[PDB]
Design a protein around this motif. Structure first.
Motif: not given
Lengths: 49, 46, 207, 48
Positions: A29-33
């Motif tokens: 979810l860090r990447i999807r941020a």
């Protein structure tokens, strides 16, 4: 327009899959941020229309 | 025209069989943001 | 001659050439600004809000089982957790953006919670002189990367004057140790103290 | 460089409860080369 057609759909195809978003994978979810942070959504809407 | 001869390669590097990989996707984007000139300069911005 | 845990440091940059220390107020003005120190001869800068203790330091996979769950020296490729010594809270990288120019430059501020999402940073060696596993010597060039955002704590020169931000430009940083473990009953700098012999007061234009 | 590399392999498995088959075969490898290098260390100092 063809180059920006390539920079867009690359990052769409590096988007982490939905079932990993249902889990709390903090890296995933860090990447999807980051990808959502880069691009404004309403820029697409004038392009899509 | 010239830069589009790499992204068509790399869009075969992370997306296969209608699915995304994980281990390559988590390392292409960590590396793509070390040189922000690699993005198109209208969004680097207009 | 080498850095450790539980000893305050002060982050200073370099930009003519000019040394900017990095401080932040807290209790109001949660964001951080810069403060110069190269002109200490004509004007003393304020070090009260610039102290930063390193209260923990882990490896990269080490905190990974802290989140799902006394003096250790530290290396490159470790993680770090700074504490603002005056305000008793932790430095972090914030959610908003004080750039307002689509630069995707995040803003550095403070945090009261002890959650480990954005409070942590990793250091990196600047050149190929040192590498992973080596200790940090006193006065070495550092690059600090977010854990949650994966951006670099860098100085920004675009919007008029200078400020600090998290974006995809790397910037050298000196760690500059300011106070190690002192002995009890002795004085060091930064000590708030009284001057008896009867105090040394002022009046409540009070000079 | 071996020392941090084996220690971070502990932190990946410090949350897991059981260890599968391939997890041990990796960890059997790294100590078998570790016993070789401590033995190769001490022959530099077995003589006084």
């Amino acid at each position: 327009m063809s180059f920006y057609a390539a920079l867009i759909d690359l990052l769409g195809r590096c988007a982490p899959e939905m079932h990993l978003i249902q889990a709390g994978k903090g890296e995933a979810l860090r990447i999807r941020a980051i990808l959502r942070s880069l691009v404004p959504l309403d820029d697409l809407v004038g392009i899509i229309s | 025209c010239g830069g589009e001869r790499y992204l068509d390669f790399l869009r075969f590097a992370v997306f296969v069989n209608g699915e995304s990989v994980e281990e390559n996707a988590n390392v292409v984007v960590r590396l793509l943001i070390r040189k922000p000139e690699c993005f198109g300069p209208a969004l680097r911005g207009s | 001659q080498f850095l450790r845990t539980d000893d305050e440091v002060v982050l200073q940059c370099s930009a003519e050439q000019l040394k900017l220390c990095l401080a932040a107020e807290g209790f109001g003005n949660r964001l951080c600004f810069l403060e110069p120190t190269s002109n200490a001869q004509n004007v003393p800068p304020d070090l009260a809000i610039c102290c930063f203790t390193l209260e923990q330091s882990l490896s990269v996979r080490a905190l990974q089982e802290m989140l799902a769950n006394g003096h250790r020296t530290l290396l490159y490729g470790h993680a770090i957790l700074l504490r603002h010594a005056h305000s008793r809270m932790y430095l972090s990288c914030l959610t908003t953006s004080r750039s307002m120019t689509d630069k995707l430059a995040f803003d550095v501020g403070l945090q009261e919670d002890a959650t480990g999402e954005a409070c942590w940073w990793t250091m990196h060696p600047a050149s190929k002189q040192r590498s992973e596993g080596e200790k940090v010597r006193v006065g070495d060039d550092l690059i600090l990367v977010s854990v949650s955002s994966e951006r670099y704590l860098h100085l920004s020169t675009a919007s008029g004057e200078l400020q600090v931000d998290a974006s995809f430009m790397q910037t050298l940083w000196n760690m500059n140790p300011i106070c190690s473990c002192c002995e009890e009953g002795y004085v060091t700098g930064g000590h708030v103290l009284r001057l008896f012999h009867e105090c040394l007061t002022i009046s409540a234009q009070r000079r | 460089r071996l020392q941090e590399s084996i220690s971070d392999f502990y932190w990946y498995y410090s949350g897991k409860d059981v260890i599968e088959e391939q997890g041990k075969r990796n960890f059997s490898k790294a100590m078998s080369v570790a016993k070789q290098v401590f033995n190769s260390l001490t022959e530099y100092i077995q003589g006084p």
